[PDB]
Amino acid sequence: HHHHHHSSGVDLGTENLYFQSMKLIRVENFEAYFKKQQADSNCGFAEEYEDLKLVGISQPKYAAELAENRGKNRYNNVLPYDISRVKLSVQTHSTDDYINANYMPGYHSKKDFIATQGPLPNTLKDFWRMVWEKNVYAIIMLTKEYWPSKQAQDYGDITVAMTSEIVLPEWTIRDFTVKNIQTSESHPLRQFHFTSWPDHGVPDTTDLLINFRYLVRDYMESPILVHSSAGVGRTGTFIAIDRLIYQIENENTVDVYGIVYDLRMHRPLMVQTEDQYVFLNQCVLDIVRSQKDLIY
Ligand SMILES: [Cl-]
Ligand code: NI
Ligand code: NI
Ligand code: NI
Ligand code: NI
Ligand code: NI
């Protein structure tokens, strides 16, 4: 009974959704389209990106604005929308449910990812609770510590213990156990840490992002938790490329505009600069160029 179509003049956000929330390009036409869009200092891509700027930002975020939850946001202007926020269980009051995090769609489902900020000192117990309560098995950390290394640490009613650390040049892979001290139930956890993605910036090469993503997929119901400082820019770019690669492999099509549109509908600022958006397109170009008769 929830399936309905809106009349005009009811929600201008929904009208935009129906009208222009997609720009689908077949891979066979993508090199020609990329050439057009990158001309004159990326004018075409800049227009796509500026058309995305107000998407999603009219949605309510009352929980995020509660006085009780102010200390739980890193920035007073990066706030989770109510509709997609990760709601935690409650012990003492309703606001116990709050964390600056959102469910983000991936290629396969609407809860494929949780996008969140790197924990604060006062939200560290909440962050590991989320990991526990939402059955997270993979964490993706994009930066340029909230976990133990030496011995087990308790964060609230959860104990975390490190079981492996492999340091590589571009990234680190850490394994943990996450154990509810009240119930004794333990889950495994793998953390994939990309170690030089600059804030507001992009990795040094497209291979680094693509190969890191494929590392995440080869080394993994349950959400993938992605975080960065604000939980939007690098986090959104990561999720986007993952969605794009699946769309290229399974469909023969690309929709960077539509995937970022969809991200913005679930959390603010996803893919936070124009260069990150252009970078997603250069990633696609390089994937397309690498996947590419005698006459008698
Ligand atoms: Cl950082
Ligand atoms: Ni229904
Ligand atoms: Ni439905
Ligand atoms: Ni219908
Ligand atoms: Ni409606
Ligand atoms: Ni900054």
Author numbering: -21 to 0, 1019 to 1140, 1151 to 1226, 1232 to 1303, 1308 to 1311
Provide text from the study.
Protein tyrosine phosphatases (PTPs) play a critical role in regulating cellular functions by selectively dephosphorylating their substrates. The ∼280 residue PTP catalytic domain consists of an α/β structure, and biochemical and structural studies have led to a detailed understanding of the catalytic mechanism (Barford et al., 1994; Zhang, 2002). Key features of the domain include the PTP signature motif, the mobile Trp-Pro-Asp “WPD” loop that in the closed conformation positions the conserved and catalytically important aspartate residue, and the phosphotyrosine recognition loop. Here we report the crystal structures of 22 PTP domains, including two tandem-domain RPTP structures and a detailed structural comparison of this protein family.
In the first category are TCPTP, SHP1, SHP2, BDP1, LYP, PEST, PTPBAS, DEP1, MEG2, and GLEPP1, which have a “PTP1B-like” accessible pocket that harbors a basic residue corresponding to Arg24 of PTP1B. This pocket has the potential to accommodate pY at the +1 position as in PTP1B or potentially other acidic or phosphorylated residues in positions N-terminal to the substrate pY. The new structural data and analysis presented here suggest that a secondary substrate-binding pocket, similar to that found in PTP1B, is present also in SHP2, BDP1, LYP, SHP1, TCPTP, MEG2, PTPBAS, DEP1, and GLEPP1. Surprisingly, sedimentation velocity measurements showed that all single-domain RPTPs studied (IA2, IA2β, GLEPP1, DEP1, and STEP) were entirely monomeric in solution, as were tandem-domain receptor PTPs (RPTPα, CD45, RPTPɛ, and RPTPμ).
